[PDB]
Design a protein around this ligand. Structure first.
Ligand code: 2AX
Length: 159
């Protein structure tokens, strides 16, 4: 099956700045600002364009050791990022991949919202494991909030 889980996260950070930092520079920021969520991010192949593979490692204790993610598309002006989880972590058993689409939109007050869709490709009619759905929500919050906090503490970053 293909099962879609969506999130709408409100952020006080303006959209262009948040896209530049959180989406396009998380390989740097995530291990820096959220080491208790992500221990390292390593480029595996590619230069950041479509088809680029990276390895995200998690600190010891988490159920998973790593995932490999693939960049699908980046739309720099519309603040849209498409990427897939293709190996490691939850990939195995009845789950083949997670296809993700993130879009950051400005809000009237000058902040932003992140529209997040995670589409899980599972075997047949097998559902996504509830623990995965939960862990994904937790990770997204930890990472976004940590980058937000960094941006608010460092006004000269990503202007
Ligand atoms: C670097 C790796 C980190 S995990 C993940 C993540 O949890 C997340 C959650 N909510 C919105 C956006 C995102 C992410 O941009 C991605 C980034 C992901 C990747 O680019 O391959």
């Amino acid at each position: 099956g293909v099962f879609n889980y969506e999130t709408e996260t409100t952020s006080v950070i303006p959209a262009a700045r948040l896209f530049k930092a959180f989406i396009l520079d998380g390989d740097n920021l995530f291990p820096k600002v959220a080491p208790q969520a992500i221990s390292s991010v390593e480029n595996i192949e590619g230069n950041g364009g479509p088809g680029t593979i990276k390895k995200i490692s998690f600190p010891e204790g988490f159920p998973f050791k790593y995932v490999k993610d693939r960049v699908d598309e980046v739309d720099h002006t519309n603040f849209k990022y498409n990427y897939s989880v293709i190996e490691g972590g939850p990939i195995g058993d009845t789950l083949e991949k997670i296809s993700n689409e993130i879009k950051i939109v400005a809000t009237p007050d000058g902040g932003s919202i992140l529209k997040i869709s995670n589409k899980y490709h599972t075997k047949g009619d097998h559902e996504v494991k509830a623990e995965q759905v939960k862990a994904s929500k937790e990770m997204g919050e930890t990472l976004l909030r940590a980058v937000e906090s960094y941006l608010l503490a460092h006004s000269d970053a990503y202007n």
